[PDB]
Amino acid sequence: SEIHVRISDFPTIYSLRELRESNLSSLVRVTGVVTRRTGVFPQLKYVKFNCLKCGSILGPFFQDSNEEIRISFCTNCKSKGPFRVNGEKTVYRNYQ
Amino acid sequence: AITARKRRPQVKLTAEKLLSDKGLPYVLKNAHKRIRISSKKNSYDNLSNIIQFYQLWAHELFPKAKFKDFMKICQTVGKTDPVLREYRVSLFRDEMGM
Amino acid sequence: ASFTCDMCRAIVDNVEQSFKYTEPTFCPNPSCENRAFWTLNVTRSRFLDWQKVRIQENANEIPTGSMPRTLDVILRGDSVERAKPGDRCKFTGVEIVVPDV
Amino acid sequence: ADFSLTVLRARIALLATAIGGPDYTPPYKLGDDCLACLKDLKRWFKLVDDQQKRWDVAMAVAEYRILTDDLLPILIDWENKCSLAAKLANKAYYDKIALNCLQLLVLMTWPLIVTEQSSSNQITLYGELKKHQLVYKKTILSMESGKVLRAAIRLALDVIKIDRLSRTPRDNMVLKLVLNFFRNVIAIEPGEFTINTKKSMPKKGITSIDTLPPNVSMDDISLNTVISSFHKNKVFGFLLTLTSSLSDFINIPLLEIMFYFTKDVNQELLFPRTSAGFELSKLLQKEHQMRKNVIKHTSARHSRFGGLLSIQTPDKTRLTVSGSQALVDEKIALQKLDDSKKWNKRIIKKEGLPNSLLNSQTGKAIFFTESNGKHFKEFINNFIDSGFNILLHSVTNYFTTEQDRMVTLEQVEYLLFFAWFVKYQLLRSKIDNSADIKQVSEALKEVTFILVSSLLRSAYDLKNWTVTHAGMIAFNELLNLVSRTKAAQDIEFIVSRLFSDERIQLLSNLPKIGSKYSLQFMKSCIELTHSVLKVLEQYSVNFQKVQANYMTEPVIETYINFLERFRELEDDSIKKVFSFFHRVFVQAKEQALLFRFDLIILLREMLSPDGLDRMSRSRKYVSQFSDYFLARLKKRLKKSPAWFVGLLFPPLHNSEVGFYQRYGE
Amino acid sequence: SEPLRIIWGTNVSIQECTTNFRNFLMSFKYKFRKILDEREEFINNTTDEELYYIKQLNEMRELGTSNLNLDARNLLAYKQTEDLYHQLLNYPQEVISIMDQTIKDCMVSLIVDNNLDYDLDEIETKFYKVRPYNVGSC
Amino acid sequence: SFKSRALNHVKKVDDVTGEKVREAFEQFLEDFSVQSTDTGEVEKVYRAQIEFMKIYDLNTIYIDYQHLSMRENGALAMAISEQYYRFLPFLQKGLRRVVRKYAPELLNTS
DNA sequence: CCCCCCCCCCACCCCCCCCCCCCCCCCCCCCCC
DNA sequence: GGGGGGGGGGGGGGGGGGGGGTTTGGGGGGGGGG
Numbered sequence A: 001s002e003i004h005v006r007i008s009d010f011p012t013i014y015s016l017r018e019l020r021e022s023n024l025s026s027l028v029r030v031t032g033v034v035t036r037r038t039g040v041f042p043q044l045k046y047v048k049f050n051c052l053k054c055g056s057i058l059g060p061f062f063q064d065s066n067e068e069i070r071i072s073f074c075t076n077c078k079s080k081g082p083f084r085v086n087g088e089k090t091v092y093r094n095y096q
Numbered sequence B: 001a002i003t004a005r006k007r008r009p010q011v012k013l014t015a016e017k018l019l020s021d022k023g024l025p026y027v028l029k030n031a032h033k034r035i036r037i038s039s040k041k042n043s044y045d046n047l048s049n050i051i052q053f054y055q056l057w058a059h060e061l062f063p064k065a066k067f068k069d070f071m072k073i074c075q076t077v078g079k080t081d082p083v084l085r086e087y088r089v090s091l092f093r094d095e096m097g098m
Numbered sequence C: 001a002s003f004t005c006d007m008c009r010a011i012v013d014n015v016e017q018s019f020k021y022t023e024p025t026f027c028p029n030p031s032c033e034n035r036a037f038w039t040l041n042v043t044r045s046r047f048l049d050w051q052k053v054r055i056q057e058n059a060n061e062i063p064t065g066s067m068p069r070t071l072d073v074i075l076r077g078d079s080v081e082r083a084k085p086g087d088r089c090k091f092t093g094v095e096i097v098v099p100d101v
Numbered sequence D: 001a002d003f004s005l006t007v008l009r010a011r012i013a014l015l016a017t018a019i020g021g022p023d024y025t026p027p028y029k030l031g032d033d034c035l036a037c038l039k040d041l042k043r044w045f046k047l048v049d050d051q052q053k054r055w056d057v058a059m060a061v062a063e064y065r066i067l068t069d070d071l072l073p074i075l076i077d078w079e080n081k082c083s084l085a086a087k088l089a090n091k092a093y094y095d096k097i098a099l100n101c102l103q104l105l106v107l108m109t110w111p112l113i114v115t116e117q118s119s120s121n122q123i124t125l126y127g128e129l130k131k132h133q134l135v136y137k138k139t140i141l142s143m144e145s146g147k148v149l150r151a152a153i154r155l156a157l158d159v160i161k162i163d164r165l166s167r168t169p170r171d172n173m174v175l176k177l178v179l180n181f182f183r184n185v186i187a188i189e190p191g192e193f194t195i196n197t198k199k200s201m202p203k204k205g206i207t208s209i210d211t212l213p214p215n216v217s218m219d220d221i222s223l224n225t226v227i228s229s230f231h232k233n234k235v236f237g238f239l240l241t242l243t244s245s246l247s248d249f250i251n252i253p254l255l256e257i258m259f260y261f262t263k264d265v266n267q268e269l270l271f272p273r274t275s276a277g278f279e280l281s282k283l284l285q286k287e288h289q290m291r292k293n294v295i296k297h298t299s300a301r302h303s304r305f306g307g308l309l310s311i312q313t314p315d316k317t318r319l320t321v322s323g324s325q326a327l328v329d330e331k332i333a334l335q336k337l338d339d340s341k342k343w344n345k346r347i348i349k350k351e352g353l354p355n356s357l358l359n360s361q362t363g364k365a366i367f368f369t370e371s372n373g374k375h376f377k378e379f380i381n382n383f384i385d386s387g388f389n390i391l392l393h394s395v396t397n398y399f400t401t402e403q404d405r406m407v408t409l410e411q412v413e414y415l416l417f418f419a420w421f422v423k424y425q426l427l428r429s430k431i432d433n434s435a436d437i438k439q440v441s442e443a444l445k446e447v448t449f450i451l452v453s454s455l456l457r458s459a460y461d462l463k464n465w466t467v468t469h470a471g472m473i474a475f476n477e478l479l480n481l482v483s484r485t486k487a488a489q490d491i492e493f494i495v496s497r498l499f500s501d502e503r504i505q506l507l508s509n510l511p512k513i514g515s516k517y518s519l520q521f522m523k524s525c526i527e528l529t530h531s532v533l534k535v536l537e538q539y540s541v542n543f544q545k546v547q548a549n550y551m552t553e554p555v556i557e558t559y560i561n562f563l564e565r566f567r568e569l570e571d572d573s574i575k576k577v578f579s580f581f582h583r584v585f586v587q588a589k590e591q592a593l594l595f596r597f598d599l600i601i602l603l604r605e606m607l608s609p610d611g612l613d614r615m616s617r618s619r620k621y622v623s624q625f626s627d628y629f630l631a632r633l634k635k636r637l638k639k640s641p642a643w644f645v646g647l648l649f650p651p652l653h654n655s656e657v658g659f660y661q662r663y664g665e
Numbered sequence E: 001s002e003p004l005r006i007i008w009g010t011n012v013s014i015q016e017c018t019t020n021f022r023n024f025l026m027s028f029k030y031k032f033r034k035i036l037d038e039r040e041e042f043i044n045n046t047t048d049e050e051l052y053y054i055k056q057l058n059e060m061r062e063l064g065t066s067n068l069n070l071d072a073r074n075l076l077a078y079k080q081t082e083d084l085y086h087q088l089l090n091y092p093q094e095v096i097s098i099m100d101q102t103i104k105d106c107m108v109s110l111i112v113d114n115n116l117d118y119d120l121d122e123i124e125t126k127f128y129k130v131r132p133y134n135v136g137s138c
Numbered sequence F: 001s002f003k004s005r006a007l008n009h010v011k012k013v014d015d016v017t018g019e020k021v022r023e024a025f026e027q028f029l030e031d032f033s034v035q036s037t038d039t040g041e042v043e044k045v046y047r048a049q050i051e052f053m054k055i056y057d058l059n060t061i062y063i064d065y066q067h068l069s070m071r072e073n074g075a076l077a078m079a080i081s082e083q084y085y086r087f088l089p090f091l092q093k094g095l096r097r098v099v100r101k102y103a104p105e106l107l108n109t110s
Numbered sequence G: 001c002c003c004c005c006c007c008c009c010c011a012c013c014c015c016c017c018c019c020c021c022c023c024c025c026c027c028c029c030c031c032c033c
Numbered sequence H: 001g002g003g004g005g006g007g008g009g010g011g012g013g014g015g016g017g018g019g020g021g022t023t024t025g026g027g028g029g030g031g032g033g034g
């Protein structure tokens, strides 16, 4: 259902000591040795959520690599409440 | 026929309390005895010699308020209350009656 | 820092940071009701290169060869990563308090 | 629906690509149909944002950066074209796109106001739209040292060349739009942080009032950059020769530019009245006095070391405080007990015009660079020496008409213009005998006084406190000038009877009302009152009769409430307050009206070690006043112990005892 | 007719405590300690007749240093200050606040009595500490 | 309409000490004059260092403390030594104005 | 003198808190004396 | 022309709801036995 482009042959290279604030959100090409590799876990990719108040479903959030999804308020009832993962409309990707 | 429901009370400096014995009669009893003013002292100290008595009396009368806020409350009740007017005019009427 | 309000997409900007990660208290839009619900705009916000380094009292100066005293030092910007472990350095800067955030 | 907004933004984005761009073969290069695209963008402003009251196009145009990335490049390159052509003499077409760029700049820099009549969309969009105007102002002043400013004057010069009659309505309008451009570029200023009050405040207030966009610093927006770019584009020369040439369609915008140059700058900053390090050393010594003061008010040992003082009162009861310094100084103990109270009296609260001397904090100053200081002071000097009386006659002879229709903003800016330049010339002429009071003679011409009187009277009758404050300032400078010319001397006696009766009463009523209004309002009331009293004394209808109208308790409340800001006031302001007290208490001898505790408190606080400067001349006046005041208070209390109660209260308006209270027989 | 500054819980007048300490901080002679303690046979005028804590305060002012070290037994030698030793041992925070303020006050008193050119601003800036010691049995 | 209140920056208090420190530092930075083992063609070292920063597009300036110490009775150096944390924003304001005056290209990453 | 051992070091209720709602007080404006 | 009463805003209190609060292996240093 998807294709990912892999950006080969990016010309500029940095060592891990060499990265800085000015590289933040930039594409980078880095050299190193893999020192510790974790397991092949599933991770959420596209996830509709359920508000436990009101008409539950919320539209699909896209999960990043960095933080949990936050739902400040339920967009249906425009208020706070408890939230839970929707078990039908959620899809997983590999993570490591 | 009905069980009570609570409601928060509030207290404020009523003219009656201002005219209690510890009110202005306290000032008349004690101010001329306690304030002393002299050329022997600087202006700041003489002003303090006034302010100390009025502050202690204000706190002993109505400890809730700050001294300046108390003074504003006193000036405004002075601007308004009729019994307080009758008392104040009675003071200067007594001085006239001397 | 720069933030956008969760219930209206207005943007607050140039939020000066204390020792805590600091978020706006009021929304700039008078049509909006919000206090304290925000998303950080990474691309608009400003960061500094930062590096803590710890120093200890110089070997010849410890009064009788005892345990040295220690201090935390903060480097920022172009001064980061110039120092090294085991190096003997002179610093200049500000002595500061840091709260338990 | 927001679908309309994204469609609109897509349209304006496409137009943004139609204007032009850099040509790599870098120079900016216009697009095909570029004139029609500029006209269509002008039409978008009209068609949507004006006709529907939206400002959506004014937001979208900033999103796609058309002003900074196309229009100023077009104007600056066109300026270089025309400059080089002038030295070496299809411009007939490129002139048109330069003009339409100027029209678009005037639109996008057009001043923003928010009122009850504004649409919900407009007041929602107001803040970020102001921020974008600030980026525009930065770019206009900075880019190529602001060469677009010379583009604007060149566009004006190309209709100033032709005859007075030959300037058609279109040419008259074009010159007016150039003036509106310069006015707007002066006038852009950071917006007010405007907060919804339905929801309560958190446990902390607003985190910051700073409303600048991230790519702007306040110095980019400051007057200094305006002076520099206007000098380096000779905008000052353009304005000076323009006002010299006046011999009136454009007169109101031309006044308005000088208002916007003057509204927030203080005249004394243009006069001195190792130097920087020397003055810094002086400043640091002054605040070191406050350091030794707080050090006296500070414990010699750690905070957990605190023992307990007990104040046993004159009665057989005891209080408790932890202050180690207070333990050996009962003054600190008493006042600290009072500081500890959780209770406070709750205090009750208290727009289409810009910030100014009307509403700024009273110590605010523009810190000029000395080059900009010289350029600005010499520019306004040459203006006074040429353009003042002619301009003031032209616009005041307008404002004789249409007073009923004069918009509030227009009224206040006219009054501030009058006051500012009159005050400046008086000060310069105090400093230089070479400068002449007659160079602002138009101020004293009787139509001017009559109009200023009509403005203040109508504003006060209408209860327009903003314009009332402006007219109060203008009256102060009129009276100030009158005193100077009475010394320098006919018209003085004319105004000194024209201001009789109801005008005396009106002037007497502002300091009655002033206690209900802001510090600057009260300050202008005090300034006006000091000027009025020195004027009447200089003349001296009856002197006792007039001053009796001032010596009444709400005026004393206004003077007190002004004086309550004593640390924030300046030495001369305190001097004026205490000269007024000198009159009331020593000269007029209505001493009973000042025997009230608020004054006693305020006198102690300012005479305190943490009060005034020990070396202040105003402290010397306060000390002199306080010595006499305490002596008379002691004497009156000795004669009348009822005043120990009366000191707490307003005096008795019941005359039958009030006379006895006032004088004691 | 006036308020009184009292060490809380004690009925000690702070003003009287202050005078009782001041009159020892000046006019105390170290001979009085040799009258109090042993070695009374070794009184020597050229070391014991000095106004000992004024000697301290003047050297302290020349060095510009904040601390006055005070052997507690010296309070019991001077007649007006014997009670103040017990007040110190039982209420030390308040008595030490009094002693600190009195040292600062006496520094001012010495420069204004001598009307000296030494900076009043320095003395006013400076915090002053008493460091009492040799209180009693360890 | 939405009930609301306007908060205005123009009624802020500005530290006249900090503003005067900024002025003194700004003057120092733009004209502190010295040269050695040469004729008196003074380098005006920190203006030249702003030009060096502009050439190399740096984002820091190096200041010798003793150069401030000799300047204008040393009051500026004493102040910046004692109470640096108050006066650093004022110093950056002064620096920003000087860089605008002699090297406006540096005010952005450019 | 050299090698092996062994020792060290390290990886459900109750309180605080915050939000919401209701009442009371204080000021301003208008009318009455 | 001043004081009372009516009406509206603003602040403070009180209640209600919610969330938080030791074994095993490995390397290196240090000491003891062949």
Ligand SMILES: [Zn+2]
Pocket (backbone or CB within 6 Å): A051, A052, A053, A054, A055, A056, A074, A075, A076, A077, A078, A079, A081
């Ligand atoms: Zn919901």
Ligand SMILES: [Zn+2]
Pocket (backbone or CB within 6 Å): C005, C006, C007, C008, C009, C010, C027, C028, C029, C032, C033, C034
């Ligand atoms: Zn919002």
